[PDB]
């Protein structure tokens, strides 16, 4: 949406001045999750379809 509200995406507690580059936002529950903080057994920056363990859990 608007880039003005892009800084509101920071990992739960974690995410300040850190790995923010590898930071993901899961469409639907999309506030924040670092690829190694809480993601599938796959911690990498994905290059395909992204969704968190919980959202993939109910499709």
């Amino acid at each position: 949406g608007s880039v003005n509200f892009v800084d509101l995406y920071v990992c739960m507690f974690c995410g300040r001045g850190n790995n923010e580059d590898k930071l993901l936002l899961c469409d639907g529950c999309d506030d924040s999750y670092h690829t190694f903080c809480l993601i599938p057994p796959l911690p990498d920056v994905p290059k395909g379809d992204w969704r968190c363990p919980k959202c993939v859990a109910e499709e």
Partner: peptide
């Protein structure tokens, strides 16, 4: 995956 790096257009 959408990242902080991508989302922003600098």
């Amino acid at each position: 995956a959408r990242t902080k790096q991508t989302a922003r257009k600098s």
